[PDB]
Amino acid sequence: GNNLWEVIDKLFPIMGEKTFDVISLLEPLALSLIQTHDPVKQLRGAFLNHVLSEMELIFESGESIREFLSVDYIDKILDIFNESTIDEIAEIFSFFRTFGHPPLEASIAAEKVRKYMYIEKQLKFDTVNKCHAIFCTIIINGYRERHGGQWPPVTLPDHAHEFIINAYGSNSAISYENAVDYYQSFIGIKFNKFIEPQLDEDLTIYMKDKALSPKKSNWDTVYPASNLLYRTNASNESRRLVEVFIADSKFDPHQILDYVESGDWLDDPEFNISYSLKEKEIKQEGRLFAKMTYKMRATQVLSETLLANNIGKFFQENGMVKGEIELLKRLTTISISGVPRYNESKKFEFKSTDIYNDGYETVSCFLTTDLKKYCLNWRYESTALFGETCNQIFGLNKLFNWLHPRLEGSTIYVGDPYCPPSDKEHISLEDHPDSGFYVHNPRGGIEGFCQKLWTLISISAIHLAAVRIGVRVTAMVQGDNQAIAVTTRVPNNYDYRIKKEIVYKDVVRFFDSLREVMDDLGHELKLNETIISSKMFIYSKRIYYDGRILPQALKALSRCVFWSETVIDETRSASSNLATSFAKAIENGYSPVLGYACS
Amino acid sequence: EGAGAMLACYDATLGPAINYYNSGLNITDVIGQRELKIFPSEVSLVGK
Amino acid sequence: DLKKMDESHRRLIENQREQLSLITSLISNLKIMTERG
Amino acid sequence: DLKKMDESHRRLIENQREQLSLITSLISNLKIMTERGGKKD
Amino acid sequence: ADLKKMDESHRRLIENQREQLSLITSLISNLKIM
Amino acid sequence: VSDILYPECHLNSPI
Amino acid sequence: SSDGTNPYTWMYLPGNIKIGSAETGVSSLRVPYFGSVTDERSEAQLGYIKNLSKPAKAAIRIAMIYTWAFGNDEISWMEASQIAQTRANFTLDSLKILTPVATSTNLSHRKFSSTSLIRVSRFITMSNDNMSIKEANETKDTNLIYQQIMLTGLSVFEYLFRLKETTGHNPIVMHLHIEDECCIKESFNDEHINPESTLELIRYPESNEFIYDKDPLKDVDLSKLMVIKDHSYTIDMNYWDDTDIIHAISICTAITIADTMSQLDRDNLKEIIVIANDDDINSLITEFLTLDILVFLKTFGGLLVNQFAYTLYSLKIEGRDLIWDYIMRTLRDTSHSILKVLSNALSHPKVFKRFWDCGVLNPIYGPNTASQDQIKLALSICEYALDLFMREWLNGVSLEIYICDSDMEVANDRKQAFISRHLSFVCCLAEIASFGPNLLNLTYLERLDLLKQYLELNIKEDPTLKYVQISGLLIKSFPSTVTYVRKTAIKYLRIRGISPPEVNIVKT
Amino acid sequence: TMIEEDEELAEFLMDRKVILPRVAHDILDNSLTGIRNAIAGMLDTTKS
Amino acid sequence: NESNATRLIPKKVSSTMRSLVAVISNSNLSQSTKQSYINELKHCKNDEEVSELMDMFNEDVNNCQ
Ligand SMILES: [Mg+2]
Ligand SMILES: [Zn+2]
Ligand SMILES: [Zn+2]
């Protein structure tokens, strides 16, 4: 670590702001160095090639860098980790926040959003139909398991196949192969209301201590008066959510649902949504998170709660609806699945061989990935059917499709108090040109909004891509990060290497199917930044390797600061946070004795 | 003594006396959630 | 003979109406996924 | 008479079924091209 | 006897199919693209 | 007097 | 020193395993024990009313807790109703009907972080067979003690092999004993602790519907309330006698085993779930120690044939002999991973001894008694269950079944489906299913009606089929999950303090 | 007047011959005091 | 025909050569064998020699166990 710091810190003078590109590329380098140890000969150094190509491109991107540095610096970065154990290589994920953070800007942040939120996409109708069929099948199977095999209230169409009608009458399960096969019987399906919308699941979601964007009439009140040429409107309306909630003369949860059902959201003339730069992200340009007005924020949080509480539990691949123990156990089982558990015409002559429990065992090969700008690639066509299905389930209409119809005719601005506009007088928001930090008429989604529906659609797409060729997979998906273990039955008389080489063929054959499915749904599975492994997969920024979790001990030690997370300077809270940080470091792979002494 | 047929037969034929028993035990004998223990099955069958 | 041909002619109509129902459902799904609020 | 009319009716019904199948097949294989955002200008 | 029943049933089914076809035409004619 | 306001001790804002 | 009288936990680690990278298939590999999966506390809720507002459920929870803790007499119920009327306006009778009975686990309440990096516990084999403390009861929970001890042993083995790459040369066995003489203390309990103060200044000024719920039930009629009251009085475990409680334990155990098999069949990576370690809780050990063998086996056979009824009918499999052969051919053809629960529960020394004393199982499948093959024991139990159920059905004794679900109407639909499957099985068994009606593309209600008509016609026309009885089922509907019913039966068993059922010239 | 009612309820719960500070805590959590505390706990910083 | 996340095709480009050197250095062979492989890889006429060297190294790795 000391050598790594010494090597990288030399780049800051010569390479001013591009150093954070290398600092971000550090983690893919660790993943590649771990990947170069797997048994399969094709997967050795397959991601390291792309990582090194990216580093060479970075190091040959300027005249100062060319005449002061060279591509030989990649060798210096690499040589400090060659011939080292797995734990030492995997430990450098704790070196993420120890290099500082880059200086952000509003125009640079909005340029990428404009670039990747204005493009027109081509979608396949059949693929969406099959994904919807898998969606309905998973819901039906979940309700069956929950209520002991009884189907939920369903009204099949007239053109339903005899197999589906027989399954409904007999109250039997449906496999995804049947769902893809008889996918035309799910086209006109129509659920009935069996879940009652509860508006009092959590009373504290309407009073979160957050900030709200001002109404569109006075949008520039975010910038302080010290940075604006003119003077803002004298109307004194609070932008924080707490005071707005306190000063609400009329309020009942029914009105939020009535607002989102009765068509009011599209007729509101005072709706404003504004981005805000994200802190402590060391990408060369920081991330963005959006905030809306009061009513729309309440509607959004209600929709998220409704979708997550009830429908989310029907899927077994959601990581956001499982407790600590259940999620840990499932992840450990999936990781262990990656290692074999047993090393070793006349007068037809047959010899009795001592078969060992059918002589076939299941082994899996792992594929972990994240999509390119997951939130920006969605469209209304992709999610309209699933929103309608959820509406039918809940007995209401057009609540879960509130995002795109509202956003398609709105303007977004990156609101930073120290990046004011150059206006001399107040100007209506929709009058500024399509440049600077304005996004006009967006199409895609927003980071952190209706993410549960996107997760369900992604799970359905993964299952369709698996069924499309015949392989079997088990997945774990949260937002963008998805880890899929492709399982295959192989003879148990073989050896380790041959079994792994057998499963690698299924993985490389399923990767193209997943790419085609995601391209059909409008997304794009980037070809060179997908982690195919035989032992490891990454989830929640942690690596699972042959059933064991590689340690990250120094990350919980780097946050043992004196005045740590204290509202006011007090000894009790600081000592509590120190003890918590040291306990976390101990349970991440630090020695208990030295951890206690250092604490 | 694998199954203990010798022990039971000798107990039946010869005089009754205390019998000390030893047998092999390896990694295969372990069960998923059961303590490692050994006892002749044939002796149990004969006794019952 | 006559009864058999009548039964076959009747049975063709169920297939035709199933095709019509499938077309209607396809158009309905297209309308749902295309038309805005 | 009866056989001739049966054959003719079967032929016309088969033609109608073929047309319906053509319509369904052409509907199913559809590429949906969404429009692009930005300032209307 | 039988012939009249056949005529009535066949006419009823044909009229039902024609009504369904007209409904389909009306439904497609209401698409915002068209 | 409201003198219970302390300046922030850790980074919590973008640079 | 203790002569084996001191409870302990047994932990074992093999000899020559490379901890770092497993380049060879390891037979001792297993999923570690991350802690007890705590069950939801919302499962202890009677599903009489389809939709209830949150204040009503809060009042029900308050009444449940108060009656569990401070007594269950009439005065305690009046005080609980007085307190619960703050959040919902429930009549005393409706509250008495709708509040379940609480246990120790209900009160015991308690991004994601791993408990520890898992290094050498993938191979550790652990057992609590020799560990048991008598002080456990409903007042004091002891699952936490067991969880703490297993986790501490796991952490000790994790720390010992922290800096060495290989496991070693010899197997490592460790006993985790406890110092029960000082720390472990028996707890007394006085159930009736009357209050001293009096609720006098409590008013009811609140009116918001999300804070207060006046008239919590709207759609419920008076006839519906009377029906619900009668049904609740029917299944009240308090007024049942000992034999009924033991029978309920056995029926719930059989249903749990069957449902676990059915749900575990679907799962993809089942072979890896079966090797996973877990605590002795929710492992059915205690009821297996205190259930009735004959009723459990008969119910298991009935559940098996009920599951296979439609497949038997579609294939026209007739006769008491061909059905058994087909069922067991199917059972042996499929993966043996689905028998995890039964195979594990039958391996306990006390469970195996109790089953063996009755002649159902004998130590025949291996050289040593303590390591009998699990799959063979499970198949033998299944064979005995099927044979016993079919022989008893032909002999003419009814079958008792419990249908448990959290919703009443779903429970009724499940009862109808169960009756339909049983009628299909009865048609198969009586060798009259070859000429029966076709049951393709029909709902279960239509199948039930058609099979009822066919069976009545065959019985009336021909008087040979006397052993075939349509009303051979006694189905009891419970408005809760099966786990809640089993726990309630076990709790009443412990409270009543009734022992489990226990069952010369030849010697000389 | 919520404070007086809360103290009186807690005293009625605990002022008995045996004190159970956990059952009373659960009852208060399920009562009005639980939602009162949940709502009032949204402000956690001195600045806000 | 190019490389992707699924496979590494040995070629003569600088990134591929660096990746091959790194994967040879991280192998579990003897130090002399790794050094000899590195020197033999540094002198390659075209992609064919690189592919042959990679095949030989893969065979040696397989036979190492
Ligand atoms: Mg992303
Ligand atoms: Zn000991
Ligand atoms: Zn002590």
Per DSSP, the three-state class of G10 is strand
Which DSSP helix (H) or strand (E) runs through A258?
helix A253-261
**Dist. CA G81–CA I27, nearest whole Å:** 74
Question: What's the token pair of residue A35?
Answer: 């990947």
Q: What angle do CA A450, A456, A459 make, to 5 degrees?
A: 140
Which DSSP helix (H) or strand (E) runs through G11?
strand G8-13
**46-75 in chain A: CB under 8 A from chain I:** 46-50, 52-53, 56, 71, 74-75
Crossing angle (nearest 10°) for helices G374-395 and G320-333: 160
Q: Are G279 and G146 in contact (CB under 8 A)?
A: yes
Three-state secondary structure string covering chain I? CCCECCECCCCCCHHHHHHHHHHHHCCCCCHHHHHHHHHHHHCCCCHHHHHHHHHHHHHHHHHHC
A480 is in an annotated binding site: yes
Q: Are I7 and I15 in contact (CB under 8 A)?
A: no
Question: What's the token pair of residue A292?
Answer: 């809306």
E strands, A284-358, are 288-291
| G202/H23 CB distance under 8 A | no
Q: What angle do CA G339, G345, G349 make, to 5 degrees?
A: 135
Q: Are A502 and A526 in contact (CB under 8 A)?
A: no
**Dist. CA A498–CA A491, nearest whole Å:** 10
C and A touching (3 or more beta-carbon pairs closer than 8 Å): yes
Q: Are G417 and A150 in contact (CB under 8 A)?
A: yes
Helices (runs of H) and strands (runs of E) counted in chain E: 1, 0
DSSP single-letter state for residue G129: T
Question: What's the token pair of residue C35?
Answer: 């038309």
Which DSSP helix (H) or strand (E) runs through A33?
helix A19-35
Q: Could you tell me the CA-to-CA distances from E30 to A386, E23, E25, G392 in Å, in that order?
A: 23, 11, 9, 67
Three-state secondary structure string covering A370-427? CCCCCCCCCCHHHHHHHHHHHHHHHCCCCCCCCHHHHHCCCEEEECCCCCCCCCCCCC
Q: Report the separation in Å between the CA atom of G182 and the middle of ligand 3, taken as the mean of its atom positions.
A: 4
Backbone conformation region of residue A589, classed left if phi is above 0, alpha if psi is from -120 to 50, else beta: left
**Which string of DSSP letters, residue by residue, matches G195-213?**
BSS---S-------TTT-B
A543 forms beta bridges with A538
The dihedral over CA atoms of B12, B15, B16, B21, expressed in degrees to the nearest 10, equals -80
DSSP single-letter state for residue G18: B
Calculate how close chain E gets to C8, using CA atoms only, in Å. Answer: 12
Per DSSP, the three-state class of H46 is coil
Q: Which of A548, A552, A596 to mutate to probe the G interface, most G CBs <10 Å? A: A548
Backbone conformation region of residue A298, classed left if phi is above 0, alpha if psi is from -120 to 50, else beta: alpha
Polymer length of chain I: 65
Q: Could you tell me the CA-to-CA distances from A119 to A114, A411, A433, A522, I21 in Å, in that order?
A: 9, 16, 18, 11, 41
Closest alpha carbon to G397 in G481, G295, G315:
G295
**Which string of DSSP letters, residue by residue, matches G33-55?**
-----PPPTTSS----SS---HH
Calculate how close chain A gets to F3, using CA atoms only, in Å. Answer: 11
Question: What's the token pair of residue E32?
Answer: 């915002």
**Dist. CA A252–CA G208, nearest whole Å:** 9
**Dist. CA G52–CA A349, nearest whole Å:** 71
Polymer length of chain D: 41
Burial class from Cβ neighbours inside 10 Å (0-12, 13-18, 19+) for residue G51 reads exposed
D32 forms beta bridges with A123
Binding positions of G for Zn(2+) are 175, 177, 182-183
Residue G94 one-letter amino acid:
S
Question: What's the token pair of residue H2?
Answer: 């919520």
Residues whose CB is less than 8 angstroms from the CB of residue I51 and which lie 6 or more positions away in sequence, other chains included: I10
In F, minimum Cα distance to H47 occurs at F5
Which DSSP helix (H) or strand (E) runs through A368?
strand A360-369
Q: What angle do CA A23, A25, A27 make, to 5 degrees?
A: 95
Longest alpha-carbon distance in chain E: 51
Which DSSP helix (H) or strand (E) runs through A362?
strand A360-369
Q: What angle do CA A304, A306, A310 make, to 5 degrees?
A: 120
DSSP single-letter state for residue A592: H
Sign of CA dihedral A79, A80, A84, A86: negative
Q: Are B43 and B5 in contact (CB under 8 A)?
A: no
Which of C24, C34, C37 lies nearest to residue A398, judging by beta carbons? C37
**Dist. CA A289–CA A283, nearest whole Å:** 15
Q: How many CB atoms are closer than 10 A to CB H17? A: 10
| A204/H48 CB distance under 8 A | no
Which DSSP helix (H) or strand (E) runs through A78?
helix A73-79
DSSP single-letter state for residue A441: S
Q: How many CB atoms are closer than 10 A to CB A59? A: 21
Which of A62-86 are b and which e, b meaning 16 or more Cβ less than 10 Å from the residue's Cβ?
eeebeeebebebbeebbeebeeeeb
| H45/A208 CB distance under 8 A | no
Q: Could you tell me the CA-to-CA distances from G204 to G58, G218, H35 in Å, in that order?
A: 16, 21, 16
Specify the experimental method. Answer: cryo-EM
A365 backbone dihedrals φ, ψ, rounded to 5°: -125, 140
Chain I environment of A75 (Cβ under 8 Å): 18
| C24/E21 CB distance under 8 A | no
Polymer length of chain B: 48
| Strand-strand pairing, A411-414 and A438-440 | antiparallel
**Dist. CA A314–CA A139, nearest whole Å:** 6
**Which string of DSSP letters, residue by residue, matches G152-197?**
HHHHHHHHHTSS-SB--SS-EEEEEE--TTTS-------S---BSS
Residues whose CB is less than 8 angstroms from the CB of residue G295 and which lie 6 or more positions away in sequence, other chains included: G247, G250, G251, G400
**Which string of DSSP letters, residue by residue, matches A504-569?**
HHHHHHHHHHHHHHHHHTT----SSS-EEESSEEEETTEEEETTEEPP--HHHHTT--SS-S-SS-
Q: Could you tell me the CA-to-CA distances from A166 to A188, G439, G447 in Å, in that order?
A: 17, 9, 12
Closest alpha carbon to G371 in A355, B18, B2, B21:
B2
Which DSSP helix (H) or strand (E) runs through G305?
helix G293-314
Q: Are G487 and G100 in contact (CB under 8 A)?
A: no
Question: What's the token pair of residue A112?
Answer: 């990428």
| Strand-strand pairing, G399-404 and G473-478 | parallel
**1-15 in chain F: CB under 8 A from chain A:** 4, 6, 9-15
**Dist. CA G151–CA A460, nearest whole Å:** 37
**Dist. CA G178–CA A378, nearest whole Å:** 58
Closest alpha carbon to G477 in G423, G422, G400:
G400
Q: Are A284 and A18 in contact (CB under 8 A)?
A: yes
Per DSSP, the three-state class of A447 is coil
Question: What's the token pair of residue G96?
Answer: 């008495």
Chain H environment of A565 (Cβ under 8 Å): none
The dihedral over CA atoms of G33, G35, G37, G38, expressed in degrees to the nearest 10, equals 160
CB contacts < 8 Å between C and D, how many?
33
Q: What angle do CA A225, A228, A230 make, to 5 degrees?
A: 95
**Which string of DSSP letters, residue by residue, matches A106-123?**
HHHHHHHHHHHHS---EE
DSSP single-letter state for residue A477: E
Sign of CA dihedral D15, D16, D21, D23: positive
**Dist. CA G408–CA G477, nearest whole Å:** 8
Q: Are D27 and C26 in contact (CB under 8 A)?
A: yes
The ligand whose atoms approach the alpha carbon of G185 most closely is 3
A250 forms beta bridges with none
Per DSSP, the three-state class of A155 is strand
Which of A120, A433, A434 lies nearest to residue D33, judging by beta carbons? A120
The sheet carrying A360-369 orders its strands as: A472-478, A481-491, A360-369, A531-533
Resolution in A: 3.3
Residue that is written with structure tokens 């030690």 in the block: A557
Per DSSP, the three-state class of G13 is strand
Chain C environment of D21 (Cβ under 8 Å): 19
Q: Are G27 and G464 in contact (CB under 8 A)?
A: no
- Chain-centroid distance of CA H28 in Å reads 5
Per DSSP, the three-state class of A491 is strand
**Dist. CA A578–CA G284, nearest whole Å:** 43
| B45/G363 CB distance under 8 A | yes
Which DSSP helix (H) or strand (E) runs through A483?
strand A481-491
Chain H environment of G211 (Cβ under 8 Å): 32, 35
Burial class from Cβ neighbours inside 10 Å (0-12, 13-18, 19+) for residue G252 reads buried
Chain H environment of A203 (Cβ under 8 Å): 35, 38-39
E strands, G326-369, are none
Sign of CA dihedral G363, G365, G367, G368: negative
Question: What's the token pair of residue A185?
Answer: 């019987």
Residue A369 one-letter amino acid:
T
The sheet carrying G172-177 orders its strands as: G125-127, G8-13, G172-177
**Dist. CA G131–CA G325, nearest whole Å:** 41
**Dist. CA G427–CA G434, nearest whole Å:** 9
Q: Could you tell me the CA-to-CA distances from A257 to A254, A271, A346, H39 in Å, in that order?
A: 5, 17, 78, 21
**Dist. CA A138–CA A173, nearest whole Å:** 10
The sheet carrying A542-545 orders its strands as: A536-539, A542-545, A548-549
Q: Are A511 and I6 in contact (CB under 8 A)?
A: yes
A308 forms beta bridges with none
Which DSSP helix (H) or strand (E) runs through H2?
helix H2-14
Chain F environment of A568 (Cβ under 8 Å): 4, 6
**Dist. CA A566–CA A584, nearest whole Å:** 18
Question: What's the token pair of residue A491?
Answer: 């003879």
Name all contacts of A311-315 with Cβ < 8 Å and 24+ positions apart. A311/A139, A311/A195, A311/A390, A311/A393, A311/A452, A311/A456, A312/A452, A312/A456, A313/A142, A314/A138, A314/A139, A314/A142, A314/A143, A314/A146, A315/A138, A315/A142, A315/A456, A315/A459
E strands, A42-168, are 122-124, 154-155
